[PDB]
Scaffold this active site. Structure first.
Site, PDB file in Angstrom:
ATOM      1  N   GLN A 114       0.847  -1.180   0.000  1.00 23.66           N
ATOM      2  CA  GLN A 114       0.000   0.000   0.000  1.00 23.66           C
ATOM      3  C   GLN A 114       0.887   1.235   0.000  1.00 23.66           C
ATOM      4  OE1 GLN A 114      -1.049  -0.608   4.615  1.00 23.66           O
ATOM      5  NE2 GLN A 114      -1.975   1.237   3.740  1.00 23.66           N
ATOM      6  N   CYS A 120      -5.161   0.832   3.080  1.00 26.48           N
ATOM      7  CA  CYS A 120      -5.470  -0.453   3.684  1.00 26.48           C
ATOM      8  C   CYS A 120      -6.910  -0.851   3.393  1.00 26.48           C
ATOM      9  CB  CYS A 120      -5.202  -0.412   5.194  1.00 26.48           C
ATOM     10  SG  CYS A 120      -6.532   0.193   6.234  1.00 26.48           S
ATOM     11  N   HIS A 257      -6.146  -0.984  11.456  1.00 27.13           N
ATOM     12  CA  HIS A 257      -5.741  -1.713  10.263  1.00 27.13           C
ATOM     13  C   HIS A 257      -6.807  -2.664   9.742  1.00 27.13           C
ATOM     14  CE1 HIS A 257      -2.733  -2.183   7.345  1.00 27.13           C
ATOM     15  NE2 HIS A 257      -2.261  -3.363   7.709  1.00 27.13           N
ATOM     16  N   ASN A 277      -1.438  -9.357   4.405  1.00 29.39           N
ATOM     17  CA  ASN A 277      -1.301  -7.936   4.707  1.00 29.39           C
ATOM     18  C   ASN A 277      -0.996  -7.122   3.452  1.00 29.39           C
ATOM     19  OD1 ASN A 277      -1.511  -5.933   6.658  1.00 29.39           O
ATOM     20  ND2 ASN A 277       0.655  -5.992   7.216  1.00 29.39           N
TER      21      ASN A 277
END
Length: 310
Positions: A114, A120, A257, A277
């Site tokens: 990202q 995110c 997150h 992630n």
């Protein structure tokens, strides 16, 4: 002790520039702090104080509050709770496996970066919005998180946003582009969606009950990748490397997150949640992190989850 020579190595190894020694020697000082933390922590593990191990990553120079400031994005929205609403999801009286991994199923795609942008929310949605394109089209491609970034007028784009708004958008707009035809840059631009590049579609989404880690477990096994939110503002999280992750300090109310649960399972005596992630391939274990499962809702793994319906 020869840290002098090494910092350079860890420097060159990454894109460390530091134009003007002003911040240079500063970031390096912080590097020693973290490096120090790792040493201790990994020692407390060998004894058995923790159940996971840490290591240096491309985020040695940065600091905790930093990343949590320029590499998160979550934006907890307004009320929605009901537990009988239209978008609620009450699993059916069936049966759930004991351990599933949606990677070996080719339902997931490589990890991305990202970057220094609260993308995110988009990277998290553009993940479950993928696992489905495979579970219905059979072909798995990489959508574009950028698309939503500079198109979902209801989200601060590179400044923040939620997921249930992307699913809603991708749908309402009649389709989400594909990273292959709209490349992520990580900076906020003008919505240049190109219909002539539709990659997937949406027809709604579903919010998993609030708190029900059990509901989280079945949803993933019955539906696939599920966009979840977490508390990633801990030094332990930032330097994760291997083993199940559980810090008795993670908060269930500090959600900053948004990640993706690529399945669950148990390992070496402890259950877990496999999460993809958006912090590059270097982070943790090649990009994924095993997050403690069935352990009092650590970092609120099942506090704000949801998935789209293709």
């Amino acid at each position: 002790e020869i840290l002098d020579t090494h910092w350079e190595l860890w420097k060159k190894t990454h894109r460390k520039q530091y134009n003007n020694k002003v911040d240079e020697i500063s970031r390096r000082l912080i590097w020693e702090k973290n490096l120090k933390y790792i040493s201790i922590h990994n020692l407390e593990a060998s004894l058995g104080v923790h159940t996971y191990e840490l290591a240096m990553n491309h985020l040695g120079d940065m600091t905790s509050e930093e990343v949590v400031q320029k590499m998160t994005g979550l934006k907890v929205p307004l009320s929605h709770s009901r537990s009988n609403d239209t978008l609620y999801i009450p699993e059916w009286e069936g049966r759930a496996p004991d351990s599933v991994d949606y990677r070996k199923k080719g339902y997931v795609t490589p990890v991305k970066n990202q970057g220094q942008c609260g993308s995110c929310w988009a990277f998290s949605s553009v993940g479950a919005l993928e696992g489905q394109l495979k579970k219905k089209t059979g072909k798995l491609l990489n959508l574009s998180p950028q698309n939503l970034v500079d198109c979902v007028s209801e989200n601060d784009g590179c400044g923040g946003g939620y997921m249930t708004n992307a699913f809603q958008y991708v749908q309402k707009n009649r389709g989400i582009d594909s990273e292959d035809a709209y490349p992520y840059v990580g900076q906020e631009e003008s919505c240049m969606y190109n219909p002539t590049g539709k990659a997937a579609k949406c027809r709604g989404y579903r919010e998993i009950p609030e708190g029900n880690e059990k509901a989280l477990k079945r949803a993933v096994a019955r539906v696939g990748p599920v966009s979840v939110a977490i508390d990633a503002s801990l030094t332990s999280f930032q330097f994760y490397s291997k083993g199940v992750y559980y810090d008795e300090s993670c908060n269930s109310d500090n959600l900053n997150h948004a990640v993706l649960a690529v399945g669950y399972g148990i390992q070496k005596g402890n259950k877990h949640w496999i999460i993809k992630n958006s912090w590059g391939e270097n982070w943790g274990n090649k990009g994924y992190i095993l997050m403690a499962r069935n352990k009092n809702n650590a970092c609120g793994i099942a506090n704000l989850a949801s998935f789209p319906k293709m």
